[PDB]
Amino acid sequence: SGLVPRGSHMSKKISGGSVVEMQGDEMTRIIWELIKEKLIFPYVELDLHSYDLGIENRDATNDQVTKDAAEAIKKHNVGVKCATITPDEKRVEEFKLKQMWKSPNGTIRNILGGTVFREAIICKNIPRLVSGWVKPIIIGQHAYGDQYRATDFVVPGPGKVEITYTPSDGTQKVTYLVHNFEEGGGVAMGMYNQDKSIEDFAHSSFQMALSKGWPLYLSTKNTILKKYDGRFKDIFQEIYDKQYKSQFEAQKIWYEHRLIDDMVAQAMKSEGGFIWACKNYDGDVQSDSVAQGYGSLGMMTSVLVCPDGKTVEAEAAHGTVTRHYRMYQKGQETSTNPIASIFAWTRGLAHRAKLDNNKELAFFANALEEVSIETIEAGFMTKDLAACIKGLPNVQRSDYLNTFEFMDKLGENLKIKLAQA
Amino acid sequence: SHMSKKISGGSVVEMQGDEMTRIIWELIKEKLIFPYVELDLHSYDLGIENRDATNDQVTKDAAEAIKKHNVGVKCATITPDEKRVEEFKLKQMWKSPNGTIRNILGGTVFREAIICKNIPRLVSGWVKPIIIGQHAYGDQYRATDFVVPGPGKVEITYTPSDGTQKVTYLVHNFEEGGGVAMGMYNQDKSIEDFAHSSFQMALSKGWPLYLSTKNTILKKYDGRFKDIFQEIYDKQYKSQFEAQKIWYEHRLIDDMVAQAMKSEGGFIWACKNYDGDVQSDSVAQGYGSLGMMTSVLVCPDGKTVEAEAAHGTVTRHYRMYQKGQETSTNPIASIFAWTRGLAHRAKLDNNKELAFFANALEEVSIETIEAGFMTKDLAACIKGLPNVQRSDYLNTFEFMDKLGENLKIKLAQA
Ligand SMILES: NC(=O)C1=CN([C@@H]2O[C@H](COP(=O)(O)OP(=O)(O)OC[C@H]3O[C@@H](n4cnc5c(N)ncnc54)[C@H](OP(=O)(O)O)[C@@H]3O)[C@@H](O)[C@H]2O)C=C[C@H]1[PH](CCC(=O)O)(CCC(=O)O)CCC(=O)O
Ligand SMILES: NC(=O)C1=CN([C@@H]2O[C@H](COP(=O)(O)OP(=O)(O)OC[C@H]3O[C@@H](n4cnc5c(N)ncnc54)[C@H](OP(=O)(O)O)[C@@H]3O)[C@@H](O)[C@H]2O)C=C[C@H]1[PH](CCC(=O)O)(CCC(=O)O)CCC(=O)O
Ligand SMILES: [Ca+2]
Ligand SMILES: [Ca+2]
Ligand SMILES: [Cl-]
Ligand SMILES: [Cl-]
DSSP states (O other): OSSOOOOSOOOOOOEEEEEEEEEOOOOHHHHHHHHIIIITTTTTTOOOOOOSSHHHHHHHTTTTHHHHHHHHHHSSSSSOOOOOOOOOOOHHHHTTTOOOOOHHHHHHHHHHOOOEEEOOOTTTTTSSSBBOOOOOOEEEEEOSSGGOOOEEEOOSSSSEEEEEEETSSOOOOOOEOOOOEEEOOOEEEEEEHHHHHHHHHHHHHHHHHHHHTTTEEEOOOOTTTTHHHHHHHHHHHIIIIIIIIIHHTTTTTTTTEEEHHHHHHHHSSSSOOEEEEEOOHHHHHHHHHHHHHHHHHEEEOEEEEEEESOOOEOOOOOOOOOHHHHHHHHTTTOOOOHHHHHHHHHHHHHHHHHHOHHHHHHHHHHHHHHHHHHHTTTTTTOOHHHHHHGGGOOOOOGGGOOHHHHHHHOOOOOOOOHHHH | OOOOOOOEEEEEEEOOOHHHHHHHHHHHHHIIITTTTTEEEEEEEEHHHHHHTTTHHHHOOOOOHHHHEEEEEEOOOOOHHHHHHHTTSSOOOOOHHHHHHHHHHOOEEEEEEETTTTTTSSSSTTOOOOOEEEEEGGGGGGOOOEOOOOOOEEEEEEEESSSSEEEEEEEEEEESSSSSEEEEEEEEHHHHHHHHHHHHHHHHHHEEEEEEEOOOEEETTTHHHHHHHHHHHHHHHHHHHHHHHOOOEEEEEEHHHHHHSSOOOOEEEEOHHHHHHHHHHHHHHHHHOTTOOOEEEEEETOOOOOEOOOOOOOOHHHHHHHTTOOOOOOOHHHHHHHHHHHHHHHHHHTTTTHHHHHHHHHHHHHHHHHHHHHHHHHHHHHOOOOGGGGSSSHHHHHHHHHHHHHHHHHHHHH
């Protein structure tokens, strides 16, 4: 039967190393398991550290699992996160929650720190809503502080709201009048940010612009918040003058501070092709406008780059697609776009491979991104993208693939691509 | 024999401004308003020179004058920064006149694009206008902010006036370096006025109303906006809305921004102060031209209005003008400031002729531009800035003069 041992038909899976996975809710959870089953695990073996951030396990552990996941990301340097339920009043009723738990993304970000870089996932055949955006716009959202770690409260009636700083060294405290309510009640809030966090934010922004060869703009409202936003402006400018200016000049680019009002108009009018450093809230809100302006709200990458220069968390930024989940729970067909979740996995695994000098893993991660884009541009897509192209009322069943058909088509094309290489 | 009589005008609080907008303001009065309308103008000079001279008192005096006369029109003004401070040798870096007038008067700033058929939008589907109603009081614009110079505790406290024990909310314990911190507030009555003005504007335009907040994150602060609007709607407006086949909904700011991008327009968008400030720039630009916007502060008394030009004082054109070089400065926003004010004056005085005039001036502006006579910025909207030749646009004086010729023709025909 032949003295020479013939080669195996099954080929050796890639050693991918250590990865923290944050499991999610509803249809995104369904998608997440399909991605692992059909796209990752046949080709990559992982030392996978899985945390269930589904709403029921967050409730059971009093949100401790979210903290545990963040600490694990510190330890292993790579996290990949599925979309999760951020509960409102209805979710409190539906799950009999102990509390209207806060957004886990905010908790993870306030623990890890850094900058969330957000960018559209561009398909040649998905039309833009903004005509001129022929190059990408990359938002760098400062991931720490401000509204997302504030303390807000109802003022029940007349009285003084004051804000006080008490120096740790025992020198005199300073007290500022926020407002004397003399005619009724209202609301008040305190919020803050940290110098070191702002410095990390500036560093990540300058470095991303220099890595791309694109100009950088930071938006603030320092005309109104002269101290608070002026601190962002000053720290960026001093870091630019100290370390990065000659690097920008050598690449013929620039960094400029802009008022947020001007910056959103300028962005809308632009051709794309720049980095936009945003304070936490502005990056949160403006990335929705950028995501929708490129064609599809969900076709975004979202990667938290932590201040240590080694740790990354990639996530799907859209929601858990509740209506599709309900259909799926009744055995009905859905057409759920998995691209954002797939790219969470590929961006995470690409950083894993960079940390590990894993050439096989890096080739794989890029190959999966290529397969996803090429599949869509070849005309095989989920219903939402079909509607981007034709308009929802004109979509017919042959224009799109359902959730399982689309995953299977990606799996076929990934197998072809890895075979050809 | 009867003399040629100007249209009765009434009492208008004028606030004069700075730089190129001051120049075009005088041009508008001279060529478009004064030859046809006779005004009882109460003029306040909010030029940065007089604001430094009076220690910003003139701004407050103008705001009170508006309280008195119910109709105010405002030119663009310099909001000084460090550069302005050194340039004019200012005593202080005074706050923006707008912020002061708004804190004094209260109300909601309604902003909306001025649409010309030949000016292409940047957002494909916006075939109907989007009207933003920006709450004009509180939040960031009245906040107390400071630099935290080193390790220490920041807390924000509430002390009831009636003696009941205070409550202290920890903001942050800075253990390593320093940072920044800030308190801000809003008032129930001002939010209720905001809601009432939003519901009324929606009913008058016959469009649905969305309010945006971030109450996912700010459950108490933004929760109050949401709760107040929902209660005032259920109790006082839902039936009228349903009668006009419109509706009111709360939306998260993230959702609202994306859906507006993807929508057809045709709705009222109630915004917290900061969001209205920022999103209206985004909307203005998305319709084609950032400066083609009306901006009208509607005060809670339901009678007092302040119309302004929202854009800046066009400093580069002013420098050209100073050196006797021609400029192409678009005066439409300042014109519509005047016409919106005059239309409110006509409404208050039941002045048929003045209302006819204000609408006519708006029509003449739009038709002039749509007939192909425009300033350089709109030419560039059409052809793209690199492709604009001198023959594609009119300079500031030529455009003003063409508007005057067309306004004379329009008023004569009727
Ligand atoms: N990451 C996360 O963790 C998120 C969790 N959620 C949780 O998802 C749950 C529901 O969320 P909805 O908002 O109701 O939306 P949906 O996902 O149900 O989709 C609505 C309709 O659109 C269509 N459709 C959408 N995705 C599709 C897909 N893949 N394929 C195909 N069709 C798709 C489809 O339409 P048809 O039904 O007609 O086919 C579908 O029904 C609730 O529990 C939310 O809390 C929401 C968003 C983020 P996000 C954090 C962002 C950040 O951290 O930066 C804000 C997003 C933003 O800012 O833009 C939460 C806010 C916070 O945490 O503060
Ligand atoms: N309302 C006001 O009173 C404002 C006053 N200012 C004060 O104006 C001063 C300068 O301002 P810049 O920011 O440098 O801009 P610019 O006006 O000089 O134009 C820059 C370039 O664009 C082009 N161009 C613009 N307008 C054109 C026009 N008509 N025709 C033709 N081409 C035109 C042209 O381009 P070329 O040169 O290539 O031809 C030109 O050079 C500074 O001193 C500022 O303080 C700024 C804006 C508002 P704003 C209140 C908004 C609100 O309350 O609703 C925030 C802006 C926003 O939110 O949208 C600040 C005050 C506050 O904080 O309250
Ligand atoms: Ca967002
Ligand atoms: Ca603005
Ligand atoms: Cl299916
Ligand atoms: Cl001229």
